[model samples]
Target: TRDQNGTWEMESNENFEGYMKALDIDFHTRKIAVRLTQTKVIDQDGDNFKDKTTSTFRNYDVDFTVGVEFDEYTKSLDNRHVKALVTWEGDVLVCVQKGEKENRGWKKWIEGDKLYLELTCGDQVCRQVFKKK
Candidate 1:
């Protein structure tokens, strides 16, 4: 399962700036955000989860459960309202964020000791890799 109990540090991300550009995040924020390494403190209790993305420029946290949806307010990242739902896609933890934006979602999976994230907004998709720390 993708129920990681430790902190995962960022190893890489692909075209995250382009993904952010589709949102309210501008050039300046991307410039700083791109350089900063990020981490996810993945945790869970029963079937519920509270995951957090920590960064130097900004941070994003989301709480959700499998099959259940909840209103999510992305504070500094995109500043939008999303009804987020998380569920297991085989061994991967899949997420679909429904909102005003089209094709907004993300996924979390693990390979070896590394954790992977694929973030999507509108037509842009960003891939991020994190190692357990």
Candidate 2:
């Protein structure tokens, strides 16, 4: 079991802008996304969680129990169709998104007061690091 508490500040966020461009996000959306600040809040109750990803432009909220299947709509991110499932691999939280694109979705892990995430879509992969507070 893991304890999910505190606020995390994003440190470095890498984006796969080309993928968004390919998805036709347009210049303005891509521009705004690149400059936007994204935060993730995770609340845990045993193996269940309510995770919220928020930004000035968009917000996403999902509730899932470990190993349960769910659907996710990336409303701000191209509106692609995706089915998501979260599972723990060791101490890391791994998410697999099945959709039109290959190798899509993200993985999250915590280490030494920091949180790290890797986002992938098609051939592009983005890495984001955050500090736990």
Candidate 3:
């Protein structure tokens, strides 16, 4: 029940460039992403949730259930269709996205009072930590 539900600002990101590279993102977009600070606006109500991932350049939103699966369309990033499933692993929220790319997914967890997101693509993993704003 300690799952954070509010606006979280990016405190730091590790290996973001490598993650973009693994997704084969273009140089121009990658350049902007590297310098941009991403924000997470999350609304949590029991097992249902809505999360908004925003930046200066683009924004993405998703509404999902913890155990139920859905089709997630990424319009701002990568622009691909994937079957996404979000589940709770103890205190962590783990997401498994099955699509064209290999080993592409993400996980979310809370450490102290901070929100932590780990993005996975190919062999690269990006760590994005956020603090309540």
Candidate 4:
């Protein structure tokens, strides 16, 4: 069913600080965020999805339906309001956030026991790898 319905622990992250800088995240938060390990718990049922990223310091939660545009408040991350839409592009789930930031979006995909995430804002891109747990 190509559904993400389990826990995934982050294995590595690259250029995350750069992406945070593009979002104007404060230096204090960036320092703490970069050091924390993140875990994703995702649930999928038909077109509805719930995605959550959790760390020792903070957690970000979101619920949306596929192909439906909704208001998104990135509270724990950047504290910004944006219109967000998620859709399946091939086997990947792609999200586009329309807001003050240019070219803001993220992509998620699964391959065997691994989960991949690519976050982009402005010209900076952060890539993350997770292992299904």
Candidate 5:
């Protein structure tokens, strides 16, 4: 079975800040994120789960079940709310956020000892890689 109840540490992060810059994340928020350590806590039960992203500067939490639709707010990132849905593509968890921005969303997947994330906003896409702790 998949390990569902665990605190996953953010081992490393890389982003195309240009994408977030285009989202108008503000200079302060961008600067803070660049230097901050972010972590995620995921509590899962079968196909349903609550995911929380935490940092010294900000925290974000969301609850959803696989294939279920819900509202998602990227408060710390862009401060915009969107109708988001999460589904599995093989073992990868994919998310599509629909709102004002065109081509905006993210995807998460695990490969070996690494975790990969791809964030998109407008025409820019940010690819991030993390290691499991």
Candidate 6:
């Protein structure tokens, strides 16, 4: 697996609005989120990880350990509470969140100079590509 602990800037995003809608996010937040550029800051220490999403309008932070289930609140995004678990599936960092929304989770992986993120809720999938900075 390649190192994923670094700052990555979003170069492009696909279907983000649909993903947000799947989570029942408000129209205003979706509009802002889709238009804003996101930056991911990741820090890892063995099995522990700190993941942060930054943007002009809002920011989100998550801290968790691999294989451990924890309570996660999707703060500014959907403002929903859920149980989240993170684990490694091959080289991909996969998260499965259980809550009111079905099929909610995200996946992150690094390839060459880019970081890829897939956010899913229900059947909507948002794919985002980030360049390592």
How many angstroms is residue 111 displaced in model 4 relative to the true structure, after the best TM-score fit?
0.8
Candidate 3 local lDDT, 57-132, one digit each (tens): 5466789998898998887778899999899999999999999988989999998889999999999999999998
lDDT ranking of the models: 4, 6, 3, 1, 5, 2
Error of 2 at 2 (Å): 51
Where does model 6 exceed 4 Å of error?
A: 1-55
Alpha carbon lDDT of each predicted model: 0.85, 0.82, 0.90, 0.92, 0.85, 0.91
Screening candidate 5 with a backbone cut-off below 3 angstroms (N, C-alpha, C), the clashing residue pairs are none
- Candidate 2 lDDT over residue span 57-115, tens digit each: 44577788879878888776787778999999999899999988889878999999999
lDDT of 4 by residue, 1-61 (tens): 6877998998888989999999999999898889788899998897788999888654677
Going through the candidates in the order shown, the clash numbers are 0, 0, 0, 0, 0, 0
- Candidate 6 lDDT over residue span 50-126, tens digit each: 99988855467788999999999897678899999999999999999999999999999999999999999999999
What is the C-alpha lDDT profile of model 5 across 9-45, one tens digit per residue?
Answer: 8777778377678888998778776766768899888
* Candidate 1 lDDT tens digits, 1-133: 7566778988888989889998879788787778777889878887778889888543676667789989999876778898999999998988888998889899999999999999998889999999998
CA error at residue 62 for candidate 4, angstroms? 0.7
- Candidates' RMSD to native: 15.9, 15.8, 15.8, 15.9, 15.5, 16.0
Q: What is the lDDT of residue 10 in candidate 3?
A: 92
Error of 1 at 68 (Å): 1.3
Query: Which pairs of residues clash in candidate 4, taking residues 3 or more apart in a chain or in different chains?
Result: none
Model 4 error, position 78 (Å): 1.4
Which residue pairs come into collision in candidate 1?
Answer: none
